[PDB]
Amino acid sequence: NKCGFQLQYQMIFSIWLLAFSPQMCEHLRRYNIIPVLSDILQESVKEKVTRIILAAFRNFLEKSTERETRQEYALAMIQCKVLKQLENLEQQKYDDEDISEDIKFLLEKLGESVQDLSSFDEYSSELKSGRLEWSPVHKSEKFWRENAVRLNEKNYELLKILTKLLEVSDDPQVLAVAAHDVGEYVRHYPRGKRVIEQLGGKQLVMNHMHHEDQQVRYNALLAVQKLMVHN
Amino acid sequence: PETPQERKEMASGVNTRIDDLQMVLNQTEDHRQRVLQAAAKNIRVWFIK
Incomplete structure (x- = not known):
């Protein structure tokens, strides 16, 4: 309801207290403050509010009870673009320890979460689960360089999923991500040109x-x- | 090519490949036009900002 600046600091203080506790941190996901807080951070440049939201973020990712809980919080963060903001704040420098130590911790943990989502098993599992919705694995170039050969595994079952989704995906996001991943496979694995021609990904994307x-x-x-990166 | 059949093979291959390259060349140049105009629509305000 757009309450005043001091009140924002106070309620983020309260959620930061809740996040301190493992079980209260686990409880509060039923609200998922992070989508609100991420964008409201853009306006609340004040040191007070920025510091307290950073502390609450650290508390979430620290006291999350399970690996899946940490993944839920971190996924909210990354899909709402907290990582670029943490890099910008890291370039920035502040009065006291807490702000910068928390930004550094959050960069560490968000990077670890990005690597986890970039896991080859995660890529295969999102392909199986239809979650072709811009998880960090899709844009992490290092993952593509390391694991583009993984799309040949199980006799190219990953590419087969992609090329079936290219004519089965009702969701435009899924369709676009399938085409893009098919192109990235050829980019990162030269022999994949003929594999994509065989599977019809060539024709499917060019259409x-x-x-x-x-x-x-x-x-x-x-x-x-x-x-068409080359012949 | 090595034989006339290989000439047919290579001719079909190059016809297809140059057609594909022409298609994606037109498409990419039109894409440059599109993205460059997208930027130009506000770039002067970008400059002053």
């Missing part, structure tokens, strides 16, 4: 660049550019 959703068109154009 879906005329898909009804401009996002799908754009991603398909990116994928076809990947295929």
Whole structure:
């Protein structure tokens, strides 16, 4: 309800107290403050509020009871783009220890979560679960360099999932991500050119660049550019 | 090519590949036009900001 600045600091103080406790941190997910706090941080540049929100973030990722709890909180963070803000604040410097020590801790933990989501097993599992929705694995270039060969595993079952979704995905996000990942496979693994020609990903993306959703068109154009990175 | 059949193979291959390259070349140049205009729509305000 857009309460005043001091009141924002006070309630973030309260949620930071709750996050301090492991079980209260586990409880409060039923509200998921982070989507609100991430964007409200953009306006609340004041040291008070920025410090307290950073502390609450550290408390979430520290006192989360399970690996899955840490993944839930971190996923909220990254999909709401907290990592770039933490990098910007790290470039920034402040009065006291807590702000910068918390930014550094959050960079550590968010990086670990990004690596976890970039796990090859996570990539396969999102392909199986239909979660082609811009998890950090998709844009982590190092993961693609390390694991582009993993798309050949199980006799190219990952590419097969992608190329079936290219004609089964009702969700434009899923369709676009499938085309983009198909292109990235060719970018990162040269022999994949003929594999994609065999599976029809070539034709599918070169067509879906005329898909009804401009996002799908754009991603398909990116994928076809990947295929045409060279001969 | 080594034989006339290989000429047919290579001719079809190069026809397909140059057609694909022409398609993606037109598409990429139009994409440059599109993205460059997207930026230009506000770039002067970007500059002054």
